[PDB]
């Protein structure tokens, strides 16, 4: 007979001991462990709610990959690249570039916990987490690789994180801040609770549905399979927050959640916001980006925080206002500066789409619509010079995304600046500046791409020089209008 897991599980995480030959602090240095001075004995209270064991893991994960890879192989000659809407193809390109090598980077966040967390249960769950993210990185390299021979922009599934392209820098600055560049407990809080439980769960569920709608069943199946792994390791953050709160560190727990949610939001708004409200065919839009944020991200955070005994972040009203506005400006920027992206942005501003935008965001046409009016007229007059930029946008010293505001009738744009140690920094929001001030040593000597441009690192000092610096290798790789401007004569 076999004995049920409950009978022996406790012994798998009975692994803390009192060091003698080195000190506790030598074995678990604060800079890597993040224990906040809480002694080993207190960490033994850490209890991951969803138990996993090695034999179970290899068995179940074997089955998941059997399915995922067999589906890919059987649909090989279905010609998805040739038969998909351009919006979907750009969605794939953006996703793979922004995500694949980042998933692999998450192995290191999980590894940080596996070695340096003082909680035994955390160290074991982080070991499964290392394995999960290894899976996700390898899947999301293997799957887009098939498309390299069709389209150089799919090279960026591998290349993006190896580049200095501006959106890749935004992604790396975020992920290196919350995954690879902090202590174990910060990773637990900022990656597994804030980012994975907080954003990627619902994003991946939404993306899998969008894939099915687009007729891409290989990708739908892939993303669904990946999402089923999340809870196994995303669960780690909650118990860590509970333990901090129980041991007099609630203020520190709150601060780290506050930081992580905002940083995730700004990157989400530039990468996914435009996809939902502009790249996805109008007929296949089930909700707006704002509705998604409201009913699937913001509410869930509110309830999870209350459950843990934390509060809504101080900036919650700023957050609520941002979901009305930010991504519309980010989309406009990505499209106008499309030559700097490794995917082809869809403008998404046909009259029918502008009607939907007005429905979902009353006042849209009085604001972003004014800019799109000018752009549209220029396209109709074949003024390609006037729909391509010569200059660099100004960039946030935190998010690495350009500084934007509300255009048109109700023009309002605000930069939040800071003089710090003899240098002038600019931030895209009150919160981004606050994040910098929470931990200036993390950020203070980082130079954003515009800082580098002004420091002579980019020659020639032109947008074209910038494109070379960003790692583009051919004309074909640079972003173009997804529909070759077909939307304008509609």
């Amino acid at each position: 007979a076999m004995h049920p897991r409950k009978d022996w599980y406790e012994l798998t995480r009975a692994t803390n001991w009192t060091p003698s030959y080195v000190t506790e602090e030598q074995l678990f240095p604060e800079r890597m462990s993040g224990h906040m001075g809480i002694p080993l004995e207190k960490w033994e209270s850490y209890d991951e709610p969803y138990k996993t064991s090695y034999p179970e893991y290899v068995s179940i994960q074997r089955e998941k990959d059997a399915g995922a890879y067999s589906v890919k192989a059987a649909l090989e000659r279905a010609k998805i690249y040739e038969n998909s809407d351009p919006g979907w193809i750009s969605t794939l390109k953006s996703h793979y570039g922004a995500i694949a090598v980042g998933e692999y980077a998450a192995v290191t966040g999980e590894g940080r916990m596996a070695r340096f967390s003082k909680a035994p249960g955390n160290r074991n769950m982080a070991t499964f987490g290392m394995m999960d993210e290894l899976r996700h990185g390898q899947l999301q390299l293997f799957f887009p690789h098939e498309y390299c021979k069709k389209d150089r922009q799919f090279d960026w599934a591998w290349r993006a994180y190896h580049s200095n392209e501006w959106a890749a820098i935004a992604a790396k600055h975020f992920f290196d801040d919350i995954i690879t560049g902090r202590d174990a407990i910060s990773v637990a809080i900022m990656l597994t609770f804030s980012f994975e439980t907080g954003f990627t769960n619902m994003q991946f569920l939404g993306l899998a549905a969008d894939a099915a709608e687009a007729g891409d069943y290989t990708f739908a199946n892939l993303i669904s399979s990946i999402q089923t792994d999340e809870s196994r390791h995303a669960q780690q953050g909650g118990p860590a927050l509970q333990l901090l709160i129980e041991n007099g560190k609630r203020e520190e727990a709150q601060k780290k959640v506050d930081m992580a949610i905002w940083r995730a939001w700004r990157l989400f708004a530039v990468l996914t916001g435009p996809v939902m409200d502009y790249y996805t065919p109008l007929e296949d839009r089930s909700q707006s980006f704002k509705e998604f944020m409201y009913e699937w991200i913001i509410g869930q955070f509110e309830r999870s925080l209350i459950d843990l005994g934390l509060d809504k972040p101080w900036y919650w009203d700023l957050f609520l206002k941002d979901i009305d506005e930010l991504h519309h400006s980010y989309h406009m920027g990505v499209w106008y500066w499309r030559t700097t992206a490794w995917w082809n942005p869809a403008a998404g501003v046909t009259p029918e789409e502008r009607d939907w935008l007005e429905e979902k965001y009353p006042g849209w046409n009085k604001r972003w619509g004014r800019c799109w009016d000018v752009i549209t007229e220029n396209v109709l007059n074949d003024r390609m010079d006037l729909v391509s930029p010569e200059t660099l946008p100004s960039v946030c010293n935190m998010s690495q995304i350009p500084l934007v505001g509300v255009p048109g009738d109700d023009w309002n744009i605000e930069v939040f600046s800071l003089e710090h140690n003899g240098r002038l920094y600019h931030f895209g929001s009150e919160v981004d500046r606050w994040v910098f001030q929470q931990d200036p040593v993390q950020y203070q000597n980082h130079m954003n791409i515009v800082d580098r441009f002004l420091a002579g690192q980019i020659q020639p000092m032109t947008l074209e020089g910038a494109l070379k610096y960003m790692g583009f290798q051919s004309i074909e790789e640079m972003g173009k209008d997804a529909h070759d401007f077909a939307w304008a004569d509609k």
Binding site: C371, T391, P393, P402, D409, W411, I413
Partner: protein
């Protein structure tokens, strides 16, 4: 004599890097910024253009130059129409 500013143009959606000259008047700065905004994302408008430190109420005199103004490199300015 290049001089970088970050400029936000009235009714546009963003702030851009615009490299101007130390000896440019504020009128000339406004034209250099406007070049990157007007008839690109902002409808052309009649009227005098003015320069101010970002979110400031006070405007720089039209014929004052960048050097005369005491502006420092990489500070943020708004370009807005005359009141």
């Amino acid at each position: 004599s290049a001089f970088p500013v970050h400029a936000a143009f009235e009714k546009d959606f963003l702030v851009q890097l615009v490299v101007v000259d130390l000896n440019d008047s504020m009128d000339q700065v406004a034209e250099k910024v406007a070049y990157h905004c007007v008839n690109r994302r902002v409808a052309p408008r009649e009227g005098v253009m003015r320069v101010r430190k970002h979110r400031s109420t006070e405007l720089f005199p039209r014929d004052m130059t960048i050097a005369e103004s005491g502006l420092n490199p990489t500070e943020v300015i708004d370009v807005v129409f005359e009141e």
